[PDB]
Amino acid sequence: SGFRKMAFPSGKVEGCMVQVTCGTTTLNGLWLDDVVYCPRHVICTSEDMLNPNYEDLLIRKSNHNFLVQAGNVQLRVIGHSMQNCVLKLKVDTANPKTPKYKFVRIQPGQTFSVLACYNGSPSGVYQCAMRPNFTIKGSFLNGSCGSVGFNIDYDCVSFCYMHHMELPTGVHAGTDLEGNFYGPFVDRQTAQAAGTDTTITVNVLAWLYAAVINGDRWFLNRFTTTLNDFNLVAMKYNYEPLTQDHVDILGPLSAQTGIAVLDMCASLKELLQNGMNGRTILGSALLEDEFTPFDVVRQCSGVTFQ
Amino acid sequence: SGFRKMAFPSGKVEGCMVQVTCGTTTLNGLWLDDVVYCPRHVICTSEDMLNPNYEDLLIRKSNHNFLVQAGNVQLRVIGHSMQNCVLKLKVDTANPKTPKYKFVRIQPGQTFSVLACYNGSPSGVYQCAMRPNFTIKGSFLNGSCGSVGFNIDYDCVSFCYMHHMELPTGVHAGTDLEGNFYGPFVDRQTAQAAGTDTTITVNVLAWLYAAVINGDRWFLNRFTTTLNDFNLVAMKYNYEPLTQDHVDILGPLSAQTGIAVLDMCASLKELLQNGMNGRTILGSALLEDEFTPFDVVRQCSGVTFQ
Numbered sequence A, B: 001s002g003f004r005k006m007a008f009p010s011g012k013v014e015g016c017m018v019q020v021t022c023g024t025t026t027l028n029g030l031w032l033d034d035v036v037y038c039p040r041h042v043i044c045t046s047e048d049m050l051n052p053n054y055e056d057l058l059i060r061k062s063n064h065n066f067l068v069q070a071g072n073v074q075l076r077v078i079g080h081s082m083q084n085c086v087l088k089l090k091v092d093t094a095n096p097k098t099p100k101y102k103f104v105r106i107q108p109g110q111t112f113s114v115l116a117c118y119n120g121s122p123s124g125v126y127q128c129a130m131r132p133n134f135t136i137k138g139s140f141l142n143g144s145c146g147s148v149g150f151n152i153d154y155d156c157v158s159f160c161y162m163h164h165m166e167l168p169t170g171v172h173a174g175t176d177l178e179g180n181f182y183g184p185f186v187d188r189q190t191a192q193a194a195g196t197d198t199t200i201t202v203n204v205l206a207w208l209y210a211a212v213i214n215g216d217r218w219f220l221n222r223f224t225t226t227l228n229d230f231n232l233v234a235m236k237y238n239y240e241p242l243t244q245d246h247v248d249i250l251g252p253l254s255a256q257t258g259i260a261v262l263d264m265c266a267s268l269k270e271l272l273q274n275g276m277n278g279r280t281i282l283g284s285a286l287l288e289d290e291f292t293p294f295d296v297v298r299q300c301s302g303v304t305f306q
């Protein structure tokens, strides 16, 4: 029993983190085979950030302008290129600890583990969700750029996020590992702000199923509702609409607990309208939306990785 | 900016987990140098648990009754002994991935990372605190026994917890790595229940400092209080008393924010008496007590490990 914000084991990723220095700027890089991936803003000075032409900035660099360190070993940079907003540094040595991996662009609502790093050295791991407004609510300090987000599927590391910047509201923005930003953000210092965020409805329902599995039943009721009646209520409270695909995804949890999805929706509708009234669910006094249906299955069934 | 429930990177510990089978029971073991540590209840059958004599049970086993697997390699057991409630299996091979490590018995209020494992394989990592009643609020399923809790200090892994059992309220009990239970629990199936829990006051104050560092100031006020006036209020709300040592530990956070500890205490006193009134702090609608002062410093200053 029990339910925690659980991250993936980070060992396979720790062995791929390196330090990258260009000029006075040091941040983190991801070393896979003979390529080091890092944010391209590493090549900028303070004067360039207002409107950088990255093609010009890169053509004026040479391979020896890039200092790449793996622990105490210096890696020799033999090539460099740019893909969207990531820099790819080719090095003379293939990382012997390269895991089986793939690169994946995730959707809002999905969750992943972040390995927060400073100077190439792992500092901590935590779980977060890609919000509907394409930011993440992370924890990052100076020097954390190039830290990556990932999932593990059996034996395979899926990299989905590389950290680039913090926005004025204190939330975070970055790219997939092919250098495409999530959301409307760009790597030039111009006025940018996150759009309004919404609550990830399918995840709240997953978490209410987790509560039932763990013995929290006080919010259940005998009613049922329809998708369209539920969604009319969800919209008013700034919740994402529920689709038939969401219903199907929750199937395994409905089956294990015996409570129909549309039954659970009537409970959520009541909680939205009357509040939780000084009660808690799974130790929380707010409805939690950063667990996917798969997170709940994994943690309430016991899936491992090799 | 930002603030998350952050666990330590787990790579150094993943390489020490093995699977241990005795009879029909399989659980996890910790392989360091040429010794595998695991809960001694692995040697029990269902009939023995009501009142096991572990000395008798162990004398009737031989080295080949213990099946120890590291991935796909079988490790050959060449000796076995018991230390308190842990079994130590001597094996013919020293773990080449043994980190620099030590064994530490922690105090209530301290936090640590748990690497949850099934069949020797890491499943997830999360952070928790050893409660004042010597339980932890973990997340564990069948087969998780022998999963360990740890901290990292520079380059050294400090093991502090090995998982043995779940109590009827859904919380968890285990031993240090020398086999001594935390709390009044014993490994015989008899009626046992956790004592009443209290809230870890010094940790709540640390977390209120974290909130200030991240821009949540609405709960501050101009007042100050005394230790003895604060503690009189804390007692009524089932909070641990605050000592002068607690005050000193919070020094670094007081200094970075400019708010005296006893100033912060007057804010907490107000929050206890009037509630948070539908407001949140660091995204929570309850006062959080599972971050130590050191956790906050580490996450709001950026300490890494090598």
Ligand SMILES: *C(=N)[C@H](C[C@@H]1CCNC1=O)NC(=O)[C@H](Cc1ccc(Cl)c(Cl)c1)NC(=O)[C@@H](NC(=O)NC(C)(C)C)C(C)(C)C
Binding pocket: A027, A041, A049, A140, A141, A142, A143, A144, A145, A146, A164, A165, A166, A167, A168, A172, A186, A187, A188, A189, A190, A191, A192, B001
């Ligand atoms: C990366 N090592 C570091 C991580 C930051 C520090 C605090 N929290 C974090 O997540 N980020 C940077 O160095 C980054 C460089 C940069 C500047 C400008 C642009 Cl457009 C990009 Cl894509 C990257 N700086 C910042 O994140 C910066 N924020 C902004 O400048 N944001 C706007 C205004 C461009 C939206 C600070 C947080 C002010 C350092």
Ligand SMILES: *C(=N)[C@H](C[C@@H]1CCNC1=O)NC(=O)[C@H](Cc1ccc(Cl)c(Cl)c1)NC(=O)[C@@H](NC(=O)NC(C)(C)C)C(C)(C)C
Binding pocket: A001, B027, B041, B049, B140, B141, B142, B143, B144, B145, B146, B164, B165, B166, B167, B168, B172, B186, B187, B188, B189, B190, B191, B192
């Ligand atoms: C270990 N692999 C497993 C982990 C459990 C499963 C569910 N959640 C967990 O944390 N634990 C056990 O196999 C354990 C064996 C055992 C039995 C009896 C005693 Cl005294 C000890 Cl120290 C260990 N069983 C249990 O944890 C058991 N709980 C109790 O029997 N608890 C009391 C009544 C002895 C307090 C179940 C949770 C019922 C399986």
